[PDB]
Design a protein around this ligand. Structure first.
Ligand SMILES: N[C@](CC1c2ccccc2Oc2ccccc21)(C(=O)O)[C@H]1C[C@@H]1C(=O)O
Ligand SMILES: N[C@](CC1c2ccccc2Oc2ccccc21)(C(=O)O)[C@H]1C[C@@H]1C(=O)O
Ligand SMILES: *[C@@H]1O[C@H](CO)[C@@H](O)[C@H](O)[C@H]1NC(C)=O
Ligand SMILES: *[C@@H]1O[C@H](CO)[C@@H](O)[C@H](O)[C@H]1NC(C)=O
Lengths: 723, 723
């Protein structure tokens, strides 16, 4: 059975008014709204005056292979058609787009929200007046980056709602760094809430599921006493038969629903339908015996459609709207292609469908009817694909005192414009659900435990530099870390001795070793004919006057600064105070006389080249040293053995003065025999005092300054009796 | 009008037997072959015995919107159908795949080669028995990489043959490095051969065009006398009405055609069709009055279908083949789904089309009929998309002597298997058409002039290293290039002097300067009480004996090797032979006497520290030098001014001996007065001899060796009279 009424040019409709029983909520509630919407068009002079509209609507029986064998009665007049209206479901309007494409006919579906239907290179005569469902992974990914929740755990639903919603959620999740944790797919029952506790720092579940497979979750997560704050897509909606099981666990969620003001005058029409004043609809004499349970038992004559039984559908403002889309596009045809006329012209029999849909239906813009406060949001655009503007609502769940009941807290069209005083989630909080907060460069060794987007960031070493965001290494041996831990610094070395409370030492030692060396110059070179310059020698003792000041200044050319040529001189300077100041004064004391000078130099230069022998490979180097990771010193190329090789090898010479001090016994054991060991105690007792030191400050000069203080009167103290 | 004959289950066909006149070549020649192919199936007991086949074929009128309004007579029995055969064109079998998909019916097209029809997620009931045209950019890109032609210039054709062939040629061109040059698109006439001469190192044109827009090219490139060797796709084919205009310019091309042996017994059938023994076909009584020009003028009773007028079509082995595809798939149905029977069982009324095409039609494999030497290439596979195996032919154009006529030189199925003795292109050549051949690393500076794939490669510098394939830089100052020009080498420096035909010089100079210094030791230190050691001094002249050998060996510690401490000694060694060997022998010659020694040292050490003064900042360095890009020397840190500062500043001392040589006139001007300038001539005359040199080999010692030869007898030659 079907219904067709003629006219100037007619429309066509499909409507699910059978079930695989009359579908009394999604069926007749919609179909009798279209026939109301026609009867305003044929009685409004500001609309199409002469184009008297009729209709030819069928019964799509909610199954695809009954639509096709029904839809051919449209196309078998090419009772002509100008465009079908309506494919209600989303599998029944994908098999009358693959057969109304092939005959150049526009198709306007009033409810069918899916995502494949906007693939306009495959369904190129299809424009609908509901938003698709790639615009619900663009609210629940913009009321997550408004509350700064960045670690969620989503659960889909199996079939064709979830797998094209969630795979459109992740691709709008990476665009705001909102990175998910766990993605289960319910087709089990208690396991999907078992896996949703193993990440307990994720307190927001994005719930993208149907309206039947989101009772068995909530009735399971009330049978385990857990709690969350859910965001959920249109499967929840405002349907108040999803919380009547467990009115406590679902408290505090926020969800979305398609916004639609009810149409006012339609309730003043549809509540005046008695089945004796409706001789037009061939289903009204079978719907009336189903929502009243009669059999026209026996029907009552006083029965009517009151306001206690006819709460109208959510989607009625998407039929009365989306038949005015056709009755304004086809108003532009008769007033442009054939002007100066009212009736259908002769150029209307070739009803160019391809020129209709692609030119001046898809680019139309007009206010909605039956709405007060016009041009607020009541304009019906179409985008560049055939999908109307998405205007949602955000429903919160404020349990005000007595009964758990829903509430509206704002909406969005392109910018989420909430009212920020309904967050009633756990007790009163903004339940952040963000893991492992960003941290300071002091703890910049951020390493993740295997799961992405939250980590541990620990302080690595104070001698280390932050190499990367997830890597740090040491700034370097001889490179000290600065605050800019990417490129840190070098390390300041240490060799300073310019008055380190010790450099005044050799100055006063020169004031006692070299200043009293002029007292040697006051007597010893002042008498070269005295009996003191006789075979009891004093012209020999100019070589003690030469070493009177060089021994008083040996560390004066060592303790300044280890510059690699300058410190090599004092490396080569230990031998001069080993032979010509000590051993030359330890060779002439065997007591010829006329040739008594040359016998000394025959034994003096036996070690003058041996200092160059140890200077063969090592020498003229001032390499640096560092032990405790922040303490660095600048020293010389000298081992402890080689430092002993200058110390304990030249201290063997005291064995060459033990018996050698004691046929020339005369007045020489009293004074020059006295200093054979009492000057050597500065070398005997000071052997292990270098073995202990490592800073080497006072021992840097006490191997010289006490010994040269002995040298101020080794023989000149006994030569102080005359003059 | 149409034709339907009943049966157990029937097939359906579309055939272009009208033109937008009966299409007597592509029409009735094909349609009457299908009805022949049926009448062997209903009379072959090894085939389907009880399934008596009938047919119901229509007239697709070569236009899309006449196929659809014709094709609904198939689908209005769901006179039932089991699968349509045939969509002939390639726009008429893309509008009976978008309407036979929607009702689960397989479709087999016998000729329709295109590329969109293998998009089997959009046309999912479509299997054809011709190869598509993504398998003709896979022969003409494999008989280009067999003759090693790698630089071509292709010309497409506008519409839907070229733009889906050439855009499938480039994507099979980059896979073998065969890179194209110019891609014009003919929709002008003479300009497309104007642009095909501006790259005259491209002698092969890939010609991917139709059969009408490839006469206007050849009839233009004969009106400009040019020449090429063409490869061309199936637009040429073997059609001998494309060369009859210009039988000389097109000589030597090679082209492709779909291989099809003619069907033998069909010519023994179709040549027995009189229009009184054919009471079945409702077009045969209008085709007969068109290929005989009669009007059944007046027809002749003796007229018949002879062998002089019925040269059969190329594509008849693709209909008699591709109706046996259905009559072997549907043989497997009746012998599996309902075995132990011959007739159609009760489970045949639900003819499961989706279970038919996707399971055991697309995976079928069977020999072709009416062909001798079976199983050579006569098996009919289907690939994983619904496209048969591509088996072409490669036609060459050997002009044998008298007439230009085509010839077959081999074929390919998956491997191009030619016969390599037909290359008859210009005179007799393999016309390589490859630009700017690869070259040696000696010329590895390969830079392209703007056009890709051919370049110029030039030799860059012999002191340069090949950095990249298109970049070279210098190997380095102090880095010599090797043959491995990626990482070349360092450069060997030059400081060698170990017997460079000059080191024996100072050895013999020591044999005359230091060996005769022992002759000074033979007399001068052998008498310290003689009148020669008196106030006429000789104990002073030990300082001439000291400098007797050090002047004989000053370059002996300079000309060895410039090691940076060792050469610094000879840098510090010029002063000793400037004062104590020369100026100390130029200070005592003012003639006290008892203190005559200390007056000399008061003036001797006036320049002993001035050598350290110029050694303040510069010194102990041995930096290297190089001028002519392959010649490097190792020298010392010495400028020409500083080398003069050791030379011309110490040569001022001759002005301190001019008047100073001449109250002590005695016997001293004869010998020691003689050497005041005749030793200075070794310093006077040798001032500019350093200003010229840069190799410094003989002048490295002649500033010493002649002067020390004077020093062998400066005073000892006059002290040679006694002893
Ligand atoms: N357009 C809907 C949307 C629908 C849907 C809506 C909410 C929850 C589950 C659900 O199941 C799917 C699955 C795929 C595509 C669309 C949906 C339809 O039924 O197709 C529905 C408004 C139409 C009506 O029933 O009036
Ligand atoms: N299948 C063909 C192939 C055809 C074609 C072949 C050669 C040159 C030009 C040309 O034009 C196009 C353009 C697009 C797709 C196919 C073609 C057809 O006519 O469609 C032709 C074998 C069918 C027949 O005519 O019997
Ligand atoms: C993060 O979101 C909260 C939610 O109220 C907001 O107040 C806050 O300003 C956001 N953070 C920053 C750094 O802006
Ligand atoms: C390039 O192609 C020619 C064509 O005859 C072939 O003989 C030759 O071997 C090919 N080049 C190489 C390097 O194989």
């Amino acid at each position: 059975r079907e219904i067709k009424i003629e006219g100037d040019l007619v429309l066509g409709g499909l409507f699910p008014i059978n079930e695989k029983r009359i579908n009394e909520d999604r069926g007749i509630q919609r179909l009798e709204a279209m026939l109301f919407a026609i009867d305003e068009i044929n009685k409004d002079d500001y609309l199409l005056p002469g184009v008297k509209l009729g209709v030819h609507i069928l019964d799509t029986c909610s199954r695809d292979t009954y639509a096709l064998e029904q839809s051919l009665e449209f196309v078998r007049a090419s009772l002509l058609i100008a465009g079908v209206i309506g494919g209600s479901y989303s599998s029944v309007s994908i098999q009358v787009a693959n057969l109304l494409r092939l005959f150049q006919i526009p198709q306007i579906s009033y409810a069918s929200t899916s995502a494949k239907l906007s693939d306009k290179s495959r369904y190129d005569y299809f424009a609908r007046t509901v938003p698709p469902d790639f615009y619900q992974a663009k609210a629940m990914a913009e009321i997550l980056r408004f509350f700064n929740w960045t670690y969620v755990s989503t659960v889909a639903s199996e079939g064709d709602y979830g797998e094209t919603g969630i795979e459109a959620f992740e691709q709008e999740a990476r665009l705001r760094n909102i990175c998910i944790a766990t993605a289960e797919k319910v087709g089990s029952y208690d396991s999907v809430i078992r896996e949703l506790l193993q990440k307990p720092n994720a307190r927001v579940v994005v719930l993208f599921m149907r309206s039947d497979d989101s009772r068995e979750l909530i009735a399971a997560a009330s049978r385990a006493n857990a709690s969350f704050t859910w965001v959920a897509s249109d499967g929840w909606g405002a349907q108040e038969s999803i919380i009547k099981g467990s009115e406590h666990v679902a408290y505090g969620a926020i969800t979305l629903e398609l916004a639609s003001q009810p149409v006012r005058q339609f309730d003043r029409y549809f509540q005046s339908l008695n089945p004796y004043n409706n001789h037009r609809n061939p289903w009204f004499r079978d719907f009336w015996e189903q929502k009243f349970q009669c059999s026209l038992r026996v029907c009552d004559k006083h029965l009517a459609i009151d306001s206690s039984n006819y709460e109208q559908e959510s989607k009625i403002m998407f039929v009365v709207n989306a038949v005015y889309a056709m009755a304004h596009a086809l108003h532009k045809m008769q007033r442009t292609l054939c002007p100066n006329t009212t009736k259908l012209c002769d150029a209307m029999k070739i009803l160019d469908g391809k020129k209709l849909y692609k030119d001046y239906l898809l680019k139309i813009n007009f206010t909605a009817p039956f709405n007060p406060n016009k041009d607020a949001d009541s304009i019906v655009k179409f985008d560049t694909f055939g999908d109307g503007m998405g205007r949602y609502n955000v429903f919160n769940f404020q349990n005000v005192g007595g009964k758990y009941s829903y509430l509206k807290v704002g909406h969005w069209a392109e910018t989420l414009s909430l009212d920020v005083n309904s967050i009633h989630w756990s007790r009163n909080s903004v339940p952040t659900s963000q893991c492992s907060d960003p941290c300071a460069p002091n703890e910049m060794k951020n390493m993740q435990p295997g799961d992405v987007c939250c980590w541990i960031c620990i302080p690595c070493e104070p001698y280390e530099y932050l190499a990367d965001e997830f890597t740090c290494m040491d700034c370097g041996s001889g490179q000290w870390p600065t605050a800019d831990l990417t490129g840190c610094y070098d390390l300041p070395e240490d060799y300073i001795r310019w008055e380190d409370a010790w450099a005044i030492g050799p100055v006063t030692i020169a004031c006692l070793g070299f200043m009293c060396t002029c007292m040697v110059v006051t007597v010893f070179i002042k008498h070269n004919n005295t009996p003191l310059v006789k075979a009891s020698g004093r012209e020999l003792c100019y070589i003690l006057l030469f070493g009177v000041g060089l021994s008083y200044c040996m560390t004066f050319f060592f303790i300044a600064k280890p510059s690699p040529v300058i410190c090599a001189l004092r490396r080569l300077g230990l031998g001069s105070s080993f032979a010509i100041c000590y051993s030359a004064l330890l060779t002439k004391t065997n007591c010829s006389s006329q040739v008594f000078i040359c016998l000394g130099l025959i034994l003096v230069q036996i070690v003058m080249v041996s200092v160059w022998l140890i200077l063969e490979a090592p020498g003229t180097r001032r390499y640096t040293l560092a032990e405790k990771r922040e303490t660095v010193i600048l020293k010389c190329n000298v081992k402890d053995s080689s430092m002993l090789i200058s110390l304990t090898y030249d201290v063997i010479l005291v064995i060459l003065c033990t018996v050698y001090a004691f046929p020339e016994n005369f007045n020489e054991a009293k004074f020059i025999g006295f200093t054979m060991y009492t000057t050597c105690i500065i070398w005997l007792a000071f052997l292990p005092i270098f073995y202990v030191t490592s800073s080497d400050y006072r021992v840097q000069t006490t191997t010289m300054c006490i010994s040269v203080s002995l040298s101020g009167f080794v023989v000149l103290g006994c030569l102080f009796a005359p003059k």
